[PDB]
Write a protein that binds this ligand. Sequence first.
Ligand SMILES: Nc1ncnc2c1ncn2[C@@H]1O[C@H](COP(=O)(O)OP(=O)(O)O)[C@@H](O)[C@H]1O
Lengths: 139, 239, 240, 238, 251, 304, 230, 48, 292
Amino acid sequence: GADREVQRILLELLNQMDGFDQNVNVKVIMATNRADTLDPALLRPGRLDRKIEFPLPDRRQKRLIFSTITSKMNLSEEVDLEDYVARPDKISGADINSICQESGMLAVRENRYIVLAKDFEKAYKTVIKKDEQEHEFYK
Amino acid sequence: SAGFDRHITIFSPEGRLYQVEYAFKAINQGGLTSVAVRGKDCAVIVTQKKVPDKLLDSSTVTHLFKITENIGCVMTGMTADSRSQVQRARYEAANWKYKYGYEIPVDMLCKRIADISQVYTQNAEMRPLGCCMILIGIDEEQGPQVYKCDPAGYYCGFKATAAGVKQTESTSFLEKKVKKKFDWTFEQTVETAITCLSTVLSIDFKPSEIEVGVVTVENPKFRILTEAEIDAHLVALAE
Amino acid sequence: TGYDLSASTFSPDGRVFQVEYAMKAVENSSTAIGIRCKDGVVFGVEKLVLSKLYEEGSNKRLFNVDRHVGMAVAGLLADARSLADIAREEASNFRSNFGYNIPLKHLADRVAMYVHAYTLYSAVRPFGCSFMLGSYSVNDGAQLYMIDPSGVSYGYWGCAIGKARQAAKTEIEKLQMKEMTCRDIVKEVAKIIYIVHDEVKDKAFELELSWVGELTNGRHEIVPKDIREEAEKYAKESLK
Amino acid sequence: NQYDNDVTVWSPQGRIHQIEYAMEAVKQGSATVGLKSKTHAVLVALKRAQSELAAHQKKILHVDNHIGISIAGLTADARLLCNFMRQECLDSRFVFDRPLPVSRLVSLIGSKTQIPTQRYGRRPYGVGLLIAGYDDMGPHIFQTCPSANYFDCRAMSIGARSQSARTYLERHMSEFMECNLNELVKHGLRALRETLPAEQDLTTKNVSIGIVGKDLEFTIYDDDDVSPFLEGLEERPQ
Amino acid sequence: SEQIRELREVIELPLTNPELFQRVGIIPPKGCLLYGPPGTGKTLLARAVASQLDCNFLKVVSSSIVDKYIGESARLIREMFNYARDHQPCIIFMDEIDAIGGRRFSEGTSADREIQRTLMELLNQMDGFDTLHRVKMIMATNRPDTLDPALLRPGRLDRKIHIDLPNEQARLDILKIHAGPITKHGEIDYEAIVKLSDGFNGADLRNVCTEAGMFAIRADHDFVVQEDFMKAVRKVADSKKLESKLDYKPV
Amino acid sequence: MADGGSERADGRIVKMEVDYSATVDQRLPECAKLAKEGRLQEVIETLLSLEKQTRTASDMVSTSRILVAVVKMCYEAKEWDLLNENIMLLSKRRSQLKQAVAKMVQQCCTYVEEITDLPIKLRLIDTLRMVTEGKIYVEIERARLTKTLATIKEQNGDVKEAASILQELQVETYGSMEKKERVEFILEQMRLCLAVKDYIRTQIISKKINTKFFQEENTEKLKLKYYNLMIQLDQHEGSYLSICKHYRAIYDTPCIQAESEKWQQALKSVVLYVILAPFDNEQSDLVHRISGDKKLEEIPKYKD
Amino acid sequence: GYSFSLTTFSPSGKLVQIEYALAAVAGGAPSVGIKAANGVVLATEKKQKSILYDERSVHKVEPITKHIGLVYSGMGPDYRVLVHRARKLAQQYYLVYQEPIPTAQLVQRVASVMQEYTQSGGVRPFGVSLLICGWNEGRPYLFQSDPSGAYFAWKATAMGKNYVNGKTFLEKRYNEDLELEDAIHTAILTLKESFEGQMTEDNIEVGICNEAGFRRLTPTEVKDYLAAIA
Amino acid sequence: GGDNEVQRTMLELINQLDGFDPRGNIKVLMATNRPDTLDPALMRPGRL
Amino acid sequence: GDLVGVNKDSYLILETLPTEYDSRVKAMEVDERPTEQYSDIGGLDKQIQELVEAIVLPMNHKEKFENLGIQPPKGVLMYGPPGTGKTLLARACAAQTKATFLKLAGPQLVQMFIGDGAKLVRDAFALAKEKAPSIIFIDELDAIGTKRFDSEKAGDREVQRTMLELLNQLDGFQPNTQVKVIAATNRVDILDPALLRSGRLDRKIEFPMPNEEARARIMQIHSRKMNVSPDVNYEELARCTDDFNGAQCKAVCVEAGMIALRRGATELTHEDYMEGILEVQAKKKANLQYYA
Ligand SMILES: Nc1ncnc2c1ncn2[C@@H]1O[C@H](COP(=O)(O)OP(=O)(O)O)[C@@H](O)[C@H]1O
C-alpha cells in the first residue's frame, strides 16, 4: 500500500499533460537530480520536449562566473584569479560563490575593505579539501 | 547507507570493502604511538611504554622485537595478534638463510609478511590480524631502510614514520621537519625522534617511559638502548 | 551487537566481542591469587564447597604441569582441564627434543599462541579460562606469569584472578615481597584470601596453597598445611 | 534468543545456553542413587516402564570387573560413551596388564566430552553418568555432567526430582562409612522412595542394585535377588 | 573559542551588522554544520549565540518528525519554515541531521522513499524559490560521513566546522568553569586531576564536579577537599569503562 | 615535605647579600626536583609556586639595579632545563609559569615608572619571547594582553606600535573578562590608527564597540574617550549631523558632572554645526529640539 | 538479495559481484597503453600521499619475461599475487618448450587463473584489471584482462579514474602508425589530461617494449621526455 | 491510539471492573478467537 | 480548558464551576499509607542508601546543599529487569517517608479526552506544588517514555502531549525542597535518558534480579495467609527458582494453593510449588522415551 499512491500521482500527471483536452498556453518547467531514474513515459516528446543538461562549469565559464561575482566586489588588486581558472579537480558553480564569500569573511576578519590575495588561497583550500584518506589502498 | 551490513569480506556497490578497513581502526585500541626515523647511516625506532601497575613487571612489556641479528621491529595494534605476527617474521627469516645461504634483505621480508596478510583478505574464514609492523635494517649499497606493513597487505618504504593513535599529527610535524636539508648525524636523528613525539602527547617522563631501538653503519647489530644512555640523549638535545 | 556472533568478524569500531564476552565469564569465578617471593612462588585459591557431598580435595584448581611448573586456573573448570593437558604435553616435547627442562618464559609463549588460535576462526570459540604459571630455577630464579583468554601473556610480581581481582591486588601491593622468604609468604597469602568474602553471600570455602621454590629444591607441590595448620590460625586473627 | 543457537556463540552475559540446555536433558531420566562405605560402593537405580506389558528399561550396566556405571539422559549418548568406556579398560589390561585407576579413567571422559562442547558441528553429550569403582585406594563414587565437570563425591543422586534424595543423604552421610554391606544397600534405597510420588511403592520389577566390593566383583541384581534386599523395610511415613 | 569566533561571523554579524557585508559586497546568511563526536559542544554554541541579541530560537531533535503517515514529515518542515518567515529574525537548530539527512539510492521501497521525500522538502525550502531571508540554520550531527551532497554544497550549509574532544588544556578550562561556584580552600591541583582525568566530555567533567561535591557532603564538610575530586575522577573513569559500542569515526 | 622548601625560603631571602647569588642557583635544582614531585598533600603545586614566588622576588631585589641580566637569564634557563630533564610540558600548565609571570608584570608595573627604556624593554622582550612560542595558550592569556598594552607605551606610538597591537587583538575577544578590560583594550588602538592616519581601519574596529552600550552606568570616563575618537574619525569626512549626534552624548554626560565651562564647550559645539549640515528634515526637527532651551541663551550664537 | 553471494543468478541478468568488482577498477590510479608501429608504450600515474614516501621502493611497470611487461589499475596488494603467479607460470612453458612464451599464450592462462577465484563460494574475485604488452615475432601486442576472465587486444586504451575522458581523447588521438617516440609524447599528454599538480620524473612511471626486449625507463630518461613534452 | 467510542466502552468497563469489585458475587467470563487482544492490565490480578 | 457557563444568545461567560470529572482521578489521592520495611527488602541496601543520598538527605540537610554550591537533584529514576522491586521499593519509600505522598499511574493520564492527559499532568503537579512537603510518584512512565530510534513511538496523539507537558512542568519549578519528583519505569533502553540529563529524571538507579534467599522469603511472606503444610524446605525453594521475579514467586504460591484446592487437600507441599512452576511458564511433562 501507498506505493501505488505514488505511482498513480504519475498517472494523473501524465493524463492532465497529454489527455484529450490539450490545455493550451500552459507551460511546465521541471528540474531534477540524476534523471536516468525516472519514467520513460515522461521523457517522450509532446510531453517533455526539451532535454537540457547542465554541466558543472567548464573552462571559459569559470571565467564568466568569476567575472560576474567579482564585478560587484571590491577586489582591486594586481593578483588575478587566472591561477585558479586553470585548476583541475572541477569546482561547481555554487562553490565559486563560496570562495568569494569566504574571502569576503576573511577580508573583514582582519579589518580590511579589500581582498589582499593571500586570503584568496586560504578560501580556495578551505572549500576544496575533501578526500583525505583512501587508506593508501585500492590506489 | 546502501548498507550491505559488511558482515563478511565481499564487495559493496560503491566499490570498496569494509571489513579490512575496519582493521585499520583496530590498531587504535592499543592506545599507543610509535615513530621510526631514517636520516643518515643510522635508523631509529622510538616508542613509549605504559606501565599501569607496580605489580606489573618492566622487562616483559617491551614492544621492540629482535627479528634477526641485523633486523629489528616494533609492533602496534593489539597485543596478542602482534606477537603471532612476529613468529612468522622470525620463521621466514630463517628459511631464507637456509634456502638461499645469505642474510635476508629488509625489503624482501615485508613482501613475505604482506603476502600472508593478503590471503586472509582474498580467502575468507580467518580474522585478518589487526596489528601493524615497522621494520629497520641496514642494506649494503643501499643504506638503512624503514618499512611499514599494513593489515591489508600493503607495504611501502619511507623516511619518517608514525603509527598508532597519532599518525596524522606526527606526520604533519615531520613534513614540516623533513623538508629542509639536514645531514642527520645520529644525535640529530634521536633528538627529532623524541621531539616529533615531543610536540604531540604532552607527557613529561623521567627517562623510564620509552624504548629506543637503533641500528647504525658502524655496528649493524640491532640494539636496544640502556636506561642510562636514554637519559643521556634526553638531556643532550636539551640544555 | 549484531556484529558479535562469530569470532572472525570485527565490530564497526574495530574489536571482537566474542573475546570480550569470554573474559567476563572468568569474572564470575572464585578468586585465585598468586605471589612470588625472592626465592619462590606461592599460589593460593579460594575454593568454595558445592553443597556438602564434595569429598575434601575433589576438582582442585591447582594443577601440576611439569616437574617444576603448575597452574592456578580460574573460570570454566572443564575448559581449563583440557588446556592443562596442552601444557603437560608441550613440556614433554621440549624434553624429548632438547634434553632439559622447559624455561617458563618459553612455555608461556607456546601456550598463549595456542590460546590465540581459538580467537580467529568461526568454527571454534575462545577459551573461558585464565590462569597463572609459577616456577623456580637456580639459573633463572622464580617467575610468575598470567594468561588472559585473548592470549596476552607477560609477567607480574603478584596477581589475582576472579571476582575480586581489583579488591585483592589493592593489598598485595602493600607487601615488601622483594625480601620476604616464601615461608613467611604462606601465612601472608592466608589473610588475603580470608579478607575477601569468607561467607557473606556464600556459605563455606576451603583454602588451597601451592608451593614452589628453593625450599622445595625446585619441586612443585602442595604445602603441608595439614602440618601446623598455621594459615587458618593466623588468618582468622584478623577478626578485630 | 538470537545467541541461543550454537555451542560456539557466547552470550553477552558469558553463559553458553546450549550447555545449559543439556543439563535439562539429565532431569528427563529417572532418579538414581550412589553411595559408598569404607569397603563397599553401591549404586541403586530406578527402572521406568514403557507400557504395562513391555519390559522395564535397564539403567545399571557392567563395564569391567571393578567398575560399573549408572545412566541418566539420552540412550544415544549412553551406549556411545559406554563403547568408549569399555575400550579404554581392556587396553590397560592389554598393555599394562593391570586394571585402570578409576580416577584417571574419568579424566579421559572429560577430555572426550570437551571437544564436542567447543567445535561446531556436534552437540554436547546429554548424559548423567554415576561411576563406582576400585583402584588401589578403595571405593569411589563419581558423577559427570554434560558440561564435562566431573565431581568426586561420597554420595550423590541425579535425575528427575532427585533433590529429595539429596536431602535424605545429607542427614545420614555420617552413618555411611561404618555400616556393613547389608544396611548400606537399604540406606540407599530409603533415598529412592522420596523420589517417588507417595501413592506407589518401590517393588521388585522396577529397581536395580549394583554392588562392587573390595573382594567382590561388580554384580548387577534384578527382579529376583532384590527380594533379599527389599525385606526388612518400613512403610512410608504418611 | 577558535571555532566559536568562526561561528559568529556567518551568523551573528549578518543580523547585527549588514554594513560590513555591503562594503566588500557579499550576502551570506547561510548557516553552518557542526560535525564532531557527541558530548562536546554541539548545542551550547547554538544556545550561546541564541542569547546574544536573541529572537525566536527553535530546537528540533529531527527524530520526532517521522511517523507512519506519509504526508506529515514534509508538513512539519513546511510549518517550521513558515513560522520562521513569520518572526523575521530567527535561528533554526536541528540536532542529528543523519537521521533524515542520508543519501538517495535505488530501492528502499517501504520506509526509505518517505525519508527521501522528507529530505527533498527540507533540501529545497531552505534554498527554494523563495529567498530565505533573515533566517539562519544550525545543523549539528555527530556522524556525518554519509550525507546528501546537495545538502553539503555551499549555498545551503556554506561553512562546516569541526569540534574536537580533548586538549589537556581545554580540559583545564572546562574543569575550572564547572568547578566554579563551589566552595573550597584553593587546594586544587587542577593539573594532576586533568592528568588522571581522561574525561573527553564536559558532561563527564560536569559529572566530576558534581560527584566531588557529593563526596564533600559525605562526612559533613562545608568545603571541598582535593581528595573529593580524585574520588570523583576514579568513579567517572570507571563508569565510562563500563560501556560498550561507543565508536568514534566521523569524517 | 615542602617545609624544607620553606626553610630553603627562609635561607635565601636573608642571605641574598650574605651568600653569593649563584648559590641560589645551587638551591635551584632541588626546588626544581620538588616541582617534579607535587604528589598529594605536602609538596604539592600550591606550595611549589611559593618557592618560585620567593626566588623571583629575591631576584628582583638583586636585579633592582641595572644589572637585570641575572633574573632574565636564570628564569629562561630554568624553564628550558626543567623541560630538558624531561620531554613536552614543564611540570604543570598552571602555576610555575603563570603565577610567576603574573609577578613579573607586577614587578614590571613597579619599576616602569623609574627605570629607563633599555633594561625594561630587555625585560619586556624576554617575556615576549617566552609567550611567543613556549607557554602560549590559555592559562593564561590576559597576562600578555596587559603586557603588550604596557609594551606599547615606550616610544609613545609610531607605525611599529600600531602593528604591534593589531596582531594581538583578534584572538583576545573570545573572553578576556568582557566587563571593561576588553572594552578599554579595544578602544586603545583606534587612536593609534588615527595617528598613522588609517581611517578605514579605524571604522571597522569602531563598529565592534557599541553592543556594550549603557557603559555610562558604572563608569564615566570610558564614554568620553570613545566619542572623542568618533568625532575625529568623521571629521576627516563630513557627516556633520553625525558629529552633532555624538555631541549630544558629549552634552548630557558632563552636565551631571556639574560643569560650568566644560559643559559649555559641549553646548556650543552642538549649536555651531547643526548649521553646517546640509538641509534635511533631520536638521529641521533637531534645531526644533536643541533650540528654545534655558541652557542655550548664554551665548550670542543663540541669536545666530 | 542477490547481491551478497556469487554462486547464484539474478532472475533477469548476470552476476552482481563481478560487476561490483569492476567498480573497484574504476576507482584506481589512471593508466594508459598505446600500441605503436614498432613498439608498445605503457604509462601509469604514481602520486604518493606525503613527501615522506620513497618512490624507488614499489614499482608499477613490471617485467614478466625479458620481452613481456605488465601494469594495472585496481588494488595494489592483489596485483602482487597474480604477478608472482604469472612469473612462475611463464617459466613452466620454458621448462617444457625451451622457448620464450608468446604473449597470446600467457593471457590464455592468466585469465584462467582469475577465472578460478570467481568460483564458489567463500573467495572474492580480484579487483584488478591488467594491461599486458610484448613484442613476439616482429609484431607487437597489447592485451587487457579483467576480473571476470575476458581478454582483448587494443590499439590503445585507458583505465582508472577519468578514463572516459581519456577514451574520448585517444579516440580522437590515435592513428594507425606512429613511431615509438611519438607514442611516448602522446602517452604523457593523455596522462597529463587528468592530473593534479606538477608532473615530475617521480609522479609518473613509464615502460616500453622494443623488439629488442622489454625495459622500464629510468627517472633521468623519463625526465628528458617530460622535459619539452609539448 | 484509538479513542473513538470503542475506548468509551473499554475505559468505562475497566473502571467498573475493579473499584466496585472487592469480594463480589458475580463472575464474568470472556471468550475470543484472537489471543492478540489480551490486556495485561486485565491480567494484572484483581481483574483476570 | 475550563467548563465555563456561557449565555446562549450573548455567548458570554456568566459562571464557570469548572473541573468536573469521574472517579479515576478521585482514586489518585493516597496519604499516610501503611508501613513496609526497607529491611524487609534484602540485598538491595545500596539502592536504599542511594535513595537516601538522593532524596532523604535533601530533606535532612536542606541547607548543606545550599551553602556548598551545588544543586540537589529532583529526578530519580528506578529501573530493573521486571518489577516487584520497582513498585515494591517505591512502596517501601513512602511507607516510612510520610511527606504527603502522591501516586500517579501512566495510562490513567491516557483518556479519550484530548489534552486532558496534559491537563491532569500539570494540575496534579501544581496541586503537589501547593502542598509543601509533597513528593510526586509516576507509575509506568515508560508507557509514554518512548521515541526509540526506528520502530516504536507509533505516532502519537497522547504520548507527545503527555511527554512534553511532563518536560514543560519539570523545567518550570525550582529544584529545592520539597517538590521532588520520582518516576517509575521498567527499562531505560525504552526511555529517553540523555534528553533528561540535567535537572530532569537524571539519577539512574538500576535493579538486579533478586537472589535465592530473597525469593525464598517472598514465598513464606506470601504463604502466610493460607494453610501451608509446615514441611517446607526453603533451600528447595531457593535454588529451584531461577529467572523468576517476586511477581512470579507470588504467582507460584497462589498457584500451589489453587492446585491444593483442585484435589481438595488442606495443605501444600514443595511439589505443589514445583507444580506451580510448571503452571507459570505453562510447562507439561510426560515420559519421552529417549531417556531410558
Ligand atoms: N566546553 C564546554 N564548556 C562548557 N560546558 C560543556 C563543555 N563541553 C560540555 N559541556 C557540558 O556538557 C553537557 C553536554 O553538552 P551537549 O552540547 O548537550 O553535548 P552534545 O554536543 O553532544 O549535544 C552540557 O550540559 C555542558 O554543560
